[PDB]
C-alpha cells in the first residue's frame, strides 16, 4: 500500500491526540465514550462527572459543554451554526450537577452569540442580538447591560469582522474580573465601514440568490471605532439603572485611528489594556486602577508601557500578552532584544526611565509563548534546543536566578519528539506534554517537581498498527546558507528516498509575515500522499519574512510584500536543483491565501524554474485585503505613504509572464476573508493578456473550502493537475 488520495480524503488513518481540561491544580476532565470523566493526578483514579445519557437528552445536537469553575453547573451548547473563523451562534441550557436537572426558568435565549462563566464561582455573561446580559445565578432573570446593540452596526462584547479575524482571534470581547465583581467589554461601531457584498446561492431550491454583506475595512478604508466599558455586576438590580464605566484610551493613541488589542485583569481593582495605532509601529499598555469613591478607572501616564519598532511592527502579529504576578506588581511579556530576538522581559507596574526592562532569557533563538507563571518559576516554550527554529520545547526558569534554566522536554524521546506543546494545571503542579512530531504524536502526564512521567495518555499505537503496510514518507528538516544566514526548509521525501534518482518537486508555500512552514511537527496530509503514492518531493522554505528567528529576518519585507519572500522561494528551488536529486523539468508550486499570492507572484516572475502551479484563494492585490492585516505590513495605500508598492506588488501586473507556465486558480465564491473579487481580477487580467490557464470556483464555499465534499473535490482536482503536469 501507498498512502493514497482516498486515504487522505476518507480519513482512514486517524492521528489521535488527547484534549483535557484542567479544572484544578491536580484534576482534569476528559472524554471517554461521549462520557466526561474526572481524573485526579495525585492518585491514578478516575471519577464519572457527566454520563453520555445527559448529552443524549439533546440527541446528537450537542456541540460543546462548559463546566462552571466551582463545578456546580454545566453549560450545554447545541444547535451550532458557524459564522466566520471563530464566531458562531448556538443554543444553551444549564445543567445543575448537584440536582441532576435542567434549569427551565429564565433560560439563555436562542441564537446566542457568545457566553462564558466567570473566572471563579458560577456567574454567566452572554451576548444576544449584539447586547450583553448577565446572570448572577442560573435560575435568575438576566440583567440587560447594554441597549445599543445592532446587527452589523454596534457590537457589545463581541468582535466585528476585522477584530475577530485579525486582532483577537476570537468572537468574545468580554472579560470577567478575577472574583467576578466587574465585567469588562469592548464596544465596536461599524458605521462608515464600507461593505463587502457577495452572492450566496444556497440550496438548489432557493429561486433567487441572496446577497451577503459584511462591514469590512479594506486597505485605507474607514475602520471600526472602539470603546471600552466596565460594568459593576454585584450592584445590578432592576430597580436601579445599570451604568457602565468607560475607560478612555491613552492620549498618545487617540490622536488618530487606533485599535484595542489586548485585555487582562491584573486584580479585582486593576486591569491592563493594550492599544495600538493604525500605523502599527506604536503600542501602549495602560495599567488602569479602580477608584472606590468616584466610580472611575484611572489610567496614570506613569503606568503606561510603550512598545515600538523602527524596522517593522509590534509583536509577531499583535503586541504580546502580559503575564502578571499574583500581587499585580510586576509582569512578564515577550519582547524584542537589542539584537532583534524575542525574549521574556520583566517589567514593573510603573514604567522606568526610557522604558527599560530586564531580559531573563537571551541568545540567537526566541521564546514562543509563556505558558505558566508561579511564585517561584516561569514556564515557557522556545526554539532554543539544537538551534532549530522549527523545534519546540518546554523550559523552566527560576525568577530569582536566571541561570537555573531547565529543559523539561528536550531528552524524553529525541528521535520521536522535537515539537512539544504543553498544558499546565491551575498552579503548575502537573503538566500534560504534547509531542507533535516528527514521530507519531505522543501525549503524556507529568509532575513538575521531578519531571516524572505519571502515565501515557495517547501513544497512537492504533495508528501505528494501521500504517504497517503503507509506504511511509520521511521528513527532512534542515537549512541552507545564504549571505551568511541560515534559512531552514523541510522536505517530505518519497518512501526510501533514493538520492541517486531525480524526483519531481512541489514547493508548498505560505511565506507570510512571521510564517513558519519548516518545522519538526508530524502531519498526515495531502503532501504525504504526493510522496507516498506519486513519489513527488514536497518542500517548504522559510525565507525572509518568516518568524521565530529574530526581527532582522521577519522585518525584511516591511512595506514590501511580494518582494523578498517570493524571490527567496524561487532561490530555494534553485538550491534544491543544485542538490542534484530534483528533476528540473518537473518543478511546481502551490499555496493557499498568502500562499496563493506567493505562488502566483512566483509563477508571474518569469524565473523559468517552475513548470506549473496552483493558487488557492489567493490575495491578488493588497488594496482588496482587510486594513488591520494589510496595513501592518504595507502601510496605507497613499502617495504620502506606500501607494507605489501597492500598485507594484499585484498579481495582475505580471499577467503576461503566465504564458510560460500552466496555472490553476481556485477560489470559494462565499469567501468572506480573501474575497472572490481577488481571483476574479486575476482571471480578468489573464484573459485580457491572452494567457491560458485553468480555473475552478467552489459555489458557496468560504476561505477554508472545508465542506466535506468540496474538500475532497479540490484536492482531487489539484492532484489530477499535478499528474498532468508531471506525468
Amino acid at each position, epitope marked *: 500500500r501507498t498512502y493514497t488520495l482516498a486515504d487522505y480524503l476518507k480519513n482512514t488513518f486517524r492521528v489521535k491526540s488527547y484534549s483535557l481540561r484542567w479544572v484544578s491544580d491536580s484534576e482534569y476532565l476528559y472524554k471517554q465514550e461521549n462520557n466526561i470523566l474526572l481524573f485526579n493526578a495525585e492518585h491514578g483514579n478516575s471519577s464519572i462527572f457527566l*454520563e453520555n445519557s445527559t448529552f443524549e*437528552i*439533546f440527541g446528537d445536537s450537542i456541540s460543546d459543554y462548559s463546566v462552571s469553575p466551582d463545578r456546580l453547573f454545566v453549560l450545554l451548547e447545541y444547535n451550532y451554526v458557524k459564522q466566520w473563523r471563530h464566531s458562531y451562534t448556538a443554543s444553551y441550557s444549564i445543567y445543575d450537577l448537584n440536582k*441532576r*436537572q*435542567l434549569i427551565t426558568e429564565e433560560k439563555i435565549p436562542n441564537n446566542t452569540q457568545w457566553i462564558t462563566w466567570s473566572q471563579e464561582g458560577h456567574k454567566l455573561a452572554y451576548v444576544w442580538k449584539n447586547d450583553i446580559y448577565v446572570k448572577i445565578e442560573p435560575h435568575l432573570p438576566s440583567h440587560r447591560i447594554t441597549s445599543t446593540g445592532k446587527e452589523n452596526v454596534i457590537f457589545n462584547g463581541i468582535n466585528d469582522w476585522v477584530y475577530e479575524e485579525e486582532i483577537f482571534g476570537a468572537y468574545s470581547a468580554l472579560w470577567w474580573s478575577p472574583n467576578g465583581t466587574f465585567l469588562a467589554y469592548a464596544q465596536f461601531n461599524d458605521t462608515g465601514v464600507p461593505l463587502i457584498e457577495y452572492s450566496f446561492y444556497s*440550496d438548489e431550491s432557493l429561486q433567487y440568490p441572496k446577497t451577503v454583506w459584511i462591514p469590512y475595512p479594506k486597505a485605507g478604508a474607514v475602520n471600526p471605532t472602539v470603546k471600552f466599558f466596565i460594568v459593576n455586576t454585584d450592584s445590578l438590580s432592576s430597580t436601579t439603572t445599570t451604568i457602565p464605566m468607560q475607560i478612555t484610551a491613552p492620549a498618545s493613541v487617540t490622536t488618530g485611528d487606533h485599535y484595542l488589542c489586548d485585555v487582562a485583569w491584573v486584580s479585582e481593582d486593576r486591569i491592563s489594556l493594550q492599544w495600538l495605532r493604525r500605523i502599527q509601529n506604536y503600542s501602549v499598555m495602560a495599567i488602569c486602577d479602580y477608584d472606590k469613591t468616584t466610580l472611575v478607572w484611572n489610567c496614570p501616564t506613569t503606568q503606561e508601557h510603550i512598545e515600538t519598532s523602527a524596522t517593522g511592527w509590534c509583536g509577531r502579529f499583535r503586541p504580546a500578552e502580559p503575564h502578571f504576578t499574583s500581587d499585580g506588581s510586576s509582569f512578564y511579556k515577550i519582547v524584542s532584544d537589542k539584537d532583534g530576538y524575542k525574549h521574556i522581559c520583566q517589567f514593573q507596574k510603573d514604567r522606568k526611565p526610557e522604558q527599560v526592562c530586564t531580559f531573563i532569557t537571551k541568545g540567537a533563538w526566541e521564546v514562543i509563548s509563556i505558558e505558566a507563571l508561579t511564585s517561584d518559576y516561569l514556564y515557557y516554550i522556545s526554539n532554543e534546543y539544537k538551534e532549530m527554529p522549527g523545534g519546540r520545547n518546554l523550559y523552566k526558569i527560576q525568577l530569582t536566578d536566571h541561570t537555573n534554566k531547565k529543559c523539561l522536554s528536550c531528552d524524553l524521546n529525541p528521535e520521536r519528539c522535537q515539537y512539544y506543546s504543553v498544558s499546565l494545571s491551575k498552579e503548575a503542579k502537573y503538566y500534560q506534554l504534547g509531542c507533535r512530531g516528527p514521530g507519531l504524536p505522543l501525549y503524556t502526564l507529568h509532575r513538575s517537581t521531578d519531571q516524572k512521567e505519571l502515565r501515557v495518555l495517547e501513544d497512537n499505537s492504533a495508528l501505528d498498527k494501521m500504517l504497517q503496510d503503507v509506504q511511509m514518507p520521511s521528513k527532512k528538516l534542515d537549512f541552507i546558507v545564504l549571505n551568511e544566514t541560515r534559512f531552514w526548509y523541510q522536505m517530505i521525501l518519497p518512501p526510501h528516498f533514493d538520492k541517486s534518482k531525480k524526483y519531481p518537486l512541489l514547493i508548498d508555500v505560505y511565506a507570510g509575515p512571521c510564517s513558519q512552514k519548516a518545522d519538526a511537527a508530524f502531519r498526515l496530509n495531502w503532501a504525504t500522499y504526493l510522496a507516498s503514492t506519486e513519489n513527488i518531493i514536497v518542500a517548504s522554505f522559510d525565507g525572509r519574512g518568516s518568524g521565530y528567528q529574530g526581527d532582522k529576518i521577519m522585518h525584511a519585507i516591511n512595506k514590501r510584500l511580494g518582494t523578498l519572500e517570493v524571490e527567496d522561494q524561487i532561490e530555494a528551488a534553485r538550491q534544491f536543483l543544485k542538490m542534484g536529486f530534483v528533476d528540473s523539468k518537473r518543478v511546481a508550486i502551490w499555496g493557499w491565501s498568502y500562499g496563493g499570492y506567493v505562488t502566483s507572484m512566483v509563477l508571474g516572475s518569469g524565473s523559468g524554474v517552475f513548470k506549473c502551479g496552483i493558487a488557492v484563494a489567493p490575495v491578488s492585490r493588497w488594496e482588496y485585503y482587510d486594513s488591520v492585516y494589510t496595513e501592518r505590513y504595507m502601510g496605507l495605500p497613499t502617495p504620502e505613504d506606500n501607494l507605489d508598492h501597492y500598485r507594484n506588488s499585484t498579481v495582475m501586473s505580471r499577467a503576461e509572464n503566465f504564458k510560460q507556465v500552466e496555472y490553476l486558480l481556485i477560489h470559494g465564491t462565499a469567501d468572506d476573508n480573501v474575497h472572490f473579487q481577488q481571483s476574479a481580477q486575476i482571471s480578468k487580467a489573464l484573459v485580457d493578456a491572452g494567457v491560458d490557464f485553468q480555473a475552478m470556483w467552489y459555489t458557496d464555499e468560504d476561505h477554508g473550502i472545508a465542506s466535506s465534499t468540496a474538500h475532497q473535490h479540490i484536492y482531487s482536482h489539484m492532484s489530477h493537475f499535478l499528474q498532468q503536469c508531471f506525468s
Partner: antibody
Amino acid sequence: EFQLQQSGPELVKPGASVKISCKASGYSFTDYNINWMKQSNGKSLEWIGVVIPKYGTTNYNQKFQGKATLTVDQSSSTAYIQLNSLTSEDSAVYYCTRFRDVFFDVWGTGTTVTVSS
Amino acid sequence: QIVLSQSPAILSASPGEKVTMTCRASSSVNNMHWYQQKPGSSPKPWLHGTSNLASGVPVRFSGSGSGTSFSLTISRVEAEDAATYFCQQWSNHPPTFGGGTKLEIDR
C-alpha cells in the same frame, strides 16, 4: 430481550389529567433514555420529551413544557408520563421509546388517549 | 425546530423493483434516521446513522445522503414491506419527523 409495554387505552373529560406507564424488561433499565412521542390520528409524529431513568433528569419540548410531566420508577423498571389539564386537542396515540445513544431502537405498543365530555 | 419534508407522500412500486426514499430539511442535518410504521401498530427502528440497519433488520435496504437531502433505498420490494416510513432528525434540537412516506405496492 427488549420489551416496552404501556398501559391500556384511556378516556377522560376535559380539565382532568392521566398518567400512562411504560414497563421495561430484559435489559439494565438504568442505562438508556426513555423518549415520548405523540401522534394525532392521520397527522405526523411529535416529540414530547425525555427522561434518563438513572437520575430522573428530564428535558421537555417547549411545546409540552406545561402539558407533560415525565417520571421514573427504577425498582419497577417503569417510566410514566403525566398529561395535565387536557382538552379535545390532546386526543392522540402516545409512544414510549428507547434511545440507544443513536436513535429510537425500541417502541412500545402505544396508548390511545381520548378526551371528551 | 427543523421542519422535515417527505418526498413523496405515497410511493407505489411493484415487488422486486427499485424504491428510493428521500427526507428534505429546511436546514442542514448531520445524520438522518428512518422508521417503519403500519396502520394500527407502533413504529419500528430500521436505519440508524443515515445507513446502518438496526438489530434484526433485513439486508435488502440501504441509506444515504448529506445536508438538506438524505435518502433510503429499498431493493427487491416484498409484500411485507407495505407500510409507512418516517424520517427522524436529531442533529438539531428539538427532534422532528417528516410527515410520512407511505410505501404502497403496485400489483
